Design a protein around this ligand. Sequence first.
Ligand SMILES: COc1c(C)c2c(c(O)c1CCOP(=O)(O)CP(=O)(O)OC[C@H]1O[C@@H](n3cnc4c(N)ncnc43)[C@H](O)[C@@H]1O)C(=O)OC2
Ligand SMILES: COc1c(C)c2c(c(O)c1CCOP(=O)(O)CP(=O)(O)OC[C@H]1O[C@@H](n3cnc4c(N)ncnc43)[C@H](O)[C@@H]1O)C(=O)OC2
Ligand SMILES: COc1c(C)c2c(c(O)c1CCOP(=O)(O)CP(=O)(O)OC[C@H]1O[C@@H](n3cnc4c(N)ncnc43)[C@H](O)[C@@H]1O)C(=O)OC2
Ligand SMILES: NC(=O)c1ncn([C@@H]2O[C@H](COP(=O)(O)O)[C@@H](O)[C@H]2O)n1
Ligand SMILES: NC(=O)c1ncn([C@@H]2O[C@H](COP(=O)(O)O)[C@@H](O)[C@H]2O)n1
Ligand SMILES: NC(=O)c1ncn([C@@H]2O[C@H](COP(=O)(O)O)[C@@H](O)[C@H]2O)n1
Ligand SMILES: NC(=O)c1ncn([C@@H]2O[C@H](COP(=O)(O)O)[C@@H](O)[C@H]2O)n1
Ligand SMILES: [K+]
Ligand SMILES: [K+]
Ligand SMILES: [K+]
Ligand SMILES: [K+]
Lengths: 454, 454, 454, 454
Amino acid sequence: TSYVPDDGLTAQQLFNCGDGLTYNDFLILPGYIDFTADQVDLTSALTKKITLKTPLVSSPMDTVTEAGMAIAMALTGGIGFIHHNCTPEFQANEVRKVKKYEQGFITDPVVLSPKGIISSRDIDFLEHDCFLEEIMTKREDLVVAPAGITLKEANEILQRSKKGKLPIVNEDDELVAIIARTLKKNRDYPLASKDAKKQLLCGAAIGTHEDDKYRLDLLAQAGVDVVVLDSSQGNSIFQINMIKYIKDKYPNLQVIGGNVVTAAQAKNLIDAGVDALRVGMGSGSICITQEVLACGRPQATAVYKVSEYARRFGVPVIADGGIQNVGHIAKALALGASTVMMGSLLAATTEAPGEYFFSDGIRLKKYRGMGSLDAMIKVAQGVSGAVQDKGSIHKFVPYLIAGIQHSCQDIGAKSLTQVRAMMYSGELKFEKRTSSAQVEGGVHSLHSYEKRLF
Amino acid sequence: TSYVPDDGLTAQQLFNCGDGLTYNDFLILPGYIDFTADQVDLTSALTKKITLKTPLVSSPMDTVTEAGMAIAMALTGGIGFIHHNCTPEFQANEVRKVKKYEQGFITDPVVLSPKGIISSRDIDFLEHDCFLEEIMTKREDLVVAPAGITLKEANEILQRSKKGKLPIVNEDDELVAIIARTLKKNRDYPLASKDAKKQLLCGAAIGTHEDDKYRLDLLAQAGVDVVVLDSSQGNSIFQINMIKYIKDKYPNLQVIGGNVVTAAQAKNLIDAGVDALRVGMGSGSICITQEVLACGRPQATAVYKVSEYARRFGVPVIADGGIQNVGHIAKALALGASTVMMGSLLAATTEAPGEYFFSDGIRLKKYRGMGSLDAMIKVAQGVSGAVQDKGSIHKFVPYLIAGIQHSCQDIGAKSLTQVRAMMYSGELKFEKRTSSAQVEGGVHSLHSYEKRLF
Amino acid sequence: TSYVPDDGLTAQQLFNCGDGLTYNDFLILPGYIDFTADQVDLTSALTKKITLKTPLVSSPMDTVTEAGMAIAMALTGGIGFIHHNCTPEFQANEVRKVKKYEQGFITDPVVLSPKGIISSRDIDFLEHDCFLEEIMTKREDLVVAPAGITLKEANEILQRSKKGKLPIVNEDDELVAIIARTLKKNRDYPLASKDAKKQLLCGAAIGTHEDDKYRLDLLAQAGVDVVVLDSSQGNSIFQINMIKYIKDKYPNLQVIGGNVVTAAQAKNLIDAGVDALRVGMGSGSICITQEVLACGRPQATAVYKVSEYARRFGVPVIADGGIQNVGHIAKALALGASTVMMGSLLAATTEAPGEYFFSDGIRLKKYRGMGSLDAMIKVAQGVSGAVQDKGSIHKFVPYLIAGIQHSCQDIGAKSLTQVRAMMYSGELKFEKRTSSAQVEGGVHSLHSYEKRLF
Amino acid sequence: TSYVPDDGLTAQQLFNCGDGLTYNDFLILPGYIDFTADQVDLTSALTKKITLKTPLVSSPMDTVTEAGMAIAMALTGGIGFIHHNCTPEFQANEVRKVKKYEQGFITDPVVLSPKGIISSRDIDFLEHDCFLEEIMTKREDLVVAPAGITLKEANEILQRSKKGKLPIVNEDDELVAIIARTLKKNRDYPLASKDAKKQLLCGAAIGTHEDDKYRLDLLAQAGVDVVVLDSSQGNSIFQINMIKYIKDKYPNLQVIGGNVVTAAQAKNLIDAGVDALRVGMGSGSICITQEVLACGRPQATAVYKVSEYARRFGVPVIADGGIQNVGHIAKALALGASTVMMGSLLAATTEAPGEYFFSDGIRLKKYRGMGSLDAMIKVAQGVSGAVQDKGSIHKFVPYLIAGIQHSCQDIGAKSLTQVRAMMYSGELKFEKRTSSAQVEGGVHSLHSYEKRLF
Ligand SMILES: COc1c(C)c2c(c(O)c1CCOP(=O)(O)CP(=O)(O)OC[C@H]1O[C@@H](n3cnc4c(N)ncnc43)[C@H](O)[C@@H]1O)C(=O)OC2
Ligand SMILES: COc1c(C)c2c(c(O)c1CCOP(=O)(O)CP(=O)(O)OC[C@H]1O[C@@H](n3cnc4c(N)ncnc43)[C@H](O)[C@@H]1O)C(=O)OC2
Ligand SMILES: COc1c(C)c2c(c(O)c1CCOP(=O)(O)CP(=O)(O)OC[C@H]1O[C@@H](n3cnc4c(N)ncnc43)[C@H](O)[C@@H]1O)C(=O)OC2
Ligand SMILES: NC(=O)c1ncn([C@@H]2O[C@H](COP(=O)(O)O)[C@@H](O)[C@H]2O)n1
Ligand SMILES: NC(=O)c1ncn([C@@H]2O[C@H](COP(=O)(O)O)[C@@H](O)[C@H]2O)n1
Ligand SMILES: NC(=O)c1ncn([C@@H]2O[C@H](COP(=O)(O)O)[C@@H](O)[C@H]2O)n1
Ligand SMILES: NC(=O)c1ncn([C@@H]2O[C@H](COP(=O)(O)O)[C@@H](O)[C@H]2O)n1
Ligand SMILES: [K+]
Ligand SMILES: [K+]
Ligand SMILES: [K+]
Ligand SMILES: [K+]
């Protein structure tokens, strides 16, 4: 015979009925492998105009994305969104801080007012004399460098002054930047996500309330590339206006639509004029909306449903919420999502806001939902907590990339663009997983065991 | 195109087959928001004649509703039902106590027999002399007030006597009431549930056994507004008679039908002449009937099924049992319920019967089913226990209201009347939730976390 | 209108497809109540010829049924089966012991050989002299009683001798029995299960292996009323022969067929000539067959399927295994079962074999499957353990009866015969229960709680 | 009537839709028993050319199969596969070591270089003198034996020298072997799996990467009988080539195809020229692929689907992964599998690699997946751990055999060949198991319990 039938379920019959299943409810039948995993191209679109080397994106939460994270993320190939739980000024600062970050050049030099350099030497010896400028008269005659400044002469010249951060200025003695030694052989970031001006990409979230139009402005000034509207149910006249307002004012600016879960919700945003859709309502580890409200939708189905529609307009979808492991990323992407947003899966990370604090013989790192009472009487829709400890976004992300690539390989696709083309064509196959199938899917029948991922 | 199909399940296909699903088995797809949550009107009917500002209702259990609770509940916009685990006299007392409660006026002044006022002063100094009247001859010549008594002159006049509870009498020196300082700026209860005589509404539960006709009488005297028949299976000739007996005797009185779960059970009660139906069999946190019997029905389905029928007669349905969180309330209401009754979700509360007693580094408050051996050889159908500690019904209820409103908003309804009109029309959409969907629905992927709701 | 549709699932569509559901997977919609629970008649058949006042039956396990249990059970209205884990002689003894038990008369007087009465007096005072008969010459001239012996003169006469167990003999000084004081006002057992000779009924289990034909014989002699073949898969040529062998030899004797789960398995036994069928394979608390084999079937479905067939021949079915609570009994009976057999649910009991032994601040009582390595290289198909502590079969059983009656009432049936007639007619309604429905079905949303059943 | 319908589900309708169920999701309805369990023949094929007495097969993991295991397994009637986590030389050694193992003859005599025998005597008395050959001049004149060596004269002759391991040599004083006393009455292995040269069978796993062709060679030399390609997704051009390469070079050699789960994946391997298929992706206790990727399939369905196809070509299927108990073996075999491979279920065993180390008052034995970071930045797809303690493969396996036989009996098949013929014909019946059915399936309703299997 040499036939072999067409066993396997198609996306349609699996996510277009009314059962409402999530990532852990299904699998993806393998295909034919004839290329190595690293040959898999993960290039994907974040918006109608922007494209990242990797589909990963950090969430706009006060415990996940902040300068450091938006930078690492961008450097590793993804992008980040600065949360909006702080006066517009500060949030806007985190943007410019990112938007004008340059290899080797000092991050954002801590500084003080006279109220010249100031090397520890002084601070030590010789009562706290009348202010700093006094206890520190660092003569104009000092080791500084001209605008011809470069990483080359920098470090080297630093040897003469045996210092590790010589200052640089344009012409009007107003520090443009300070080169720094601290790393000893900077790596190369070939996938770095940057804009036209070669600066790293940077996103930012804002509300849809009136007092957010000013906030947006400060961000816009700072060179923000894309902004996402923060809402649990983004299909409101408020967001729609907020959309129009922004698109009009700033034509040259991408706007991602508030969190939606239905094709109907999307229609309004795609019409308002959005550049993408953030799909996901009540899937976040810290989000507890479905339990305290009554509205929401199972992630896997939501991502599939909203993408199949959004695609018909060239509007990328960001699968936000529900990604509890590498696996769930490939899943979300295979269902129509162009990129995926993470929060908890990127909390412990060292680039994330906050500091670690061992608790009960185990590592730790704060992490809560922006809808929690702390982050914010108001009805709490989120919870507060903390997670373990992962490596650094510079090594963690690369691991995610390998997984996603290994996933694509097992399936038979050499790119994410293909994975989607396959599932929409009916070539990509799926299969439901019973509770026992889920149990067998993970670790079982062991007396004890540990786990290390990369 | 600009079409977007009609994705979404309708109530019918979801609760009218035979799967028997509960609140945690489904969700409600969001709609369009074009109004703020606080604009949502929660007005709902408790019976054919009565209407509350809020659909909340405390349960007739000896650990939930009692004077204090029936008062707070009424003040916050809902209503309460005094349990019937105590001689009719006492239960009847709790009613009048409620029915004639007035702002500022002392609750129910504790008192003693001679066997004039009696300020601590005496009790202290000068052997327990022959009875109270002796160890306390408080002269007729004392600070008291005339029927012109008002909160105005009251407190003020109290200053002269530097006391905090001057007595007031009509004419025949028989204390009608005592004004009291103890609060320092009473709030305003705009939603208060009151009757024609401007007195707070008050409900009361009674059995269907013969010896309950006298009990009902004492309650009726006390000015009870509505009574609910307490039974697990209320479709018995006993209740039906008890219905007729009451409707006849007291025409001007609402009667809620025993707990039912089917349209067939309802028919008998709607015919007997009930003013509402209490739907719910074996859903209560402390009820364990389904485990020790064989009869019952999944709450969500029961509420939907009995309401779709009851509505065809203008008979309100009270979704009693199964409400484990704010979310489940909106759910019950969206399925055809006019109001919802709670027990455990209103136990810890300070207005509830009993006192707290820290246990294992944690707060506590007794709570058990009226079907438990303690509350009541008889077959125990309930269990006994206790819960944590919530705020006060004066702040807790308001939180429930916000939730329910936030829920209605997310859906797209500006009132509960609308939410039901939407689900019966097919506009309101639902989606089943798999076990994984339920797991993703709540908190997951966190190393640890705490939870605060309002 | 006044119609009300026909909501509700019928047994057929619920247990005749291939889903394989158990008791916890469904419920029984209530009906109309017009009679009190105690008016419910539980009379049910155990075999084609025998009938018990109650459908309860103790299991033939070395930790459940033994003389004491087969007696209490019979007295409370049910029946018991002596296990066969002991030489035929001893098992046969437990039978006669039961079969000839009489109110007041000493159970089975412990005794010694000379190698007259022997009151402690002696044992105490005056070296262990040459044997008992010597250290105890209780003269012929002693307080004894004639065959006219009766509970009347007995106790009374005992006063004169101030003893508590005067001996009685026929004529040939061979103790027929000894009356005993130890209770102080024996109760009345109106439901007692007895045979023609007014003796309590008694069952007994035997294997189907060759060496079991002798064992059966000793039992037969002892006046056993019914015997059950002990097998996990009773549809073997071995049992079929064993059936024929017995039916032939002892026509006047009931034989219950080995454990089966299908209508096909039953056909062979009903033809071999059985008087009943023990349905249930791998449902017992201690049975772990399904996990270590590959054959078996979900109890609820098995009971329904085998009964619908067996009934077509007047062959009663004993729902054995899976009854984890009062509720599951009514369920099994409502599906076609005539009686139900229990093991674990009757372990802690005081009438059960073994003694209690507090462990970890909690009561205890051994309990294991006859298929366990201990009870019995052989493949273990059962496990060994222990349970808590229930009352006495004289109070526990009565509780089960109330439940079963309360269950029948809630449904609307005044007898078990009716409950079955209702489910087979399509009048009795059912509804599946989702996992959440099962969770809501039991205790939930409580911070803590205890449980007392009767 | 005497008909009895055809209740029961067929494999087809149960594993050929898209639900994806595992072993714990179904059962096998019993049939007719007319033969004893030990009469059941378990003979099954491992490949197109090879046949084992028992369908058991140890997995190629560095914690399961290694010489000792491949020997015991072969002796008990099955076969084993040496893992490939060690230079080809060593892995190849483990093969020859096995391939030339002979009863009584010393396993693999530990040895040292001069850098004659060497009995402890010396080592003790008389500074570590210049090397061994010196501190030990065991004269040529010593107790040794000629090629006529046999277990007969061996042991006996050993008495004269009162030693326990006399050396034997061919002619050129180059030890061919050493007979040893250490057991005191060697048993008989009637089912031993051997090749034409009467040597025990031995399998070995290799990768499909280029540098594996040399490795294969060393194994081939050592007399390996069958080799299995180690891959999670074995349907790649790499394996297909690796297949062709081997089949060509070594015609007289069996090759088992990489792990597959679909009929489509199989087609390529059956065409490449494989002798069997290893079905199973992400079912292993230590495999966590489905959780960190997105591809895989529920074992039960995979085994059924791939076998129904593979059989159409006479290509045996090895159900690898998911076997958590005796029961699951019969299940896998009944669905079309010819043999089953185990890992964890054969870890604790004494023949397995590694030594035990009590931990927390309990026994222990290391066990991890070859995909774990330890066994192997790379993406970890497995985990590391350890299990309890089972007996010895010489007693454990026999237990598995009894189970599998007991299973076959309960069904009604006298051989595995029959079990499959029955399920493909539609005679063998199945039934799904709900979560409650699964709960009832195992141990429940017990206050406590222990477990011993054989
Ligand atoms: C905000 O972040 C989230 C996100 C992204 C998600 C979830 C979530 O719970 C949160 C936290 C809660 O966000 P939100 O539900 O509070 C939405 P939002 O922040 O826009 O607040 C909405 C309310 O603000 C008021 N509002 C919004 N815009 C205006 C406006 N233009 N004028 C007046 N009032 C407005 C209304 O009361 C409207 O209901 C979730 O479950 O899935 C995704
Ligand atoms: C009473 O509260 C509940 C409620 C409200 C619920 C559940 C529950 O378990 C209880 C506790 C138990 O109530 P109930 O089942 O004991 C019902 P009820 O209190 O009316 O007692 C009923 C029995 O009393 C006797 N009875 C009732 N009325 C009469 C009568 N008129 N004459 C004689 N006997 C009567 C009968 O034996 C009838 O079976 C439940 O599972 O869902 C809701
Ligand atoms: C015995 O009790 C049970 C019961 C009642 C149940 C289960 C259970 O596991 C046990 C314990 C195990 O009983 P069994 O499976 O060992 C059945 P049985 O005691 O009859 O032993 C059967 C074997 O004995 C041998 N045999 C039986 N009769 C003969 C015979 N006539 N001649 C020769 N051999 C025979 C055969 O090897 C036959 O397979 C269960 O899962 O559901 C109900
Ligand atoms: N409910 C809340 O308080 C809250 N806080 C954040 N979120 C949503 O959950 C997402 C993160 O989900 P996760 O941690 O990847 O499961 C965020 O991007 C945001 O959309 N929700
Ligand atoms: N079974 C019992 O003892 C018992 N006690 C109270 N109840 C029922 O449960 C309801 C409360 O449910 P809950 O606590 O909101 O889940 C009560 O209103 C009553 O109808 N049941
Ligand atoms: N597998 C075993 O060892 C074993 N031992 C007893 N049993 C079966 O289980 C039944 C008791 O079930 P349960 O305890 O009521 O769930 C017994 O009547 C018997 O049929 N099974
Ligand atoms: N993922 C991993 O690291 C790993 N290691 C081994 N395995 C697979 O799992 C199988 C063993 O499964 P189990 O232990 O019987 O459930 C092995 O034969 C192999 O196919 N997988
Ligand atoms: K969630
Ligand atoms: K309950
Ligand atoms: K069981
Ligand atoms: K697994």
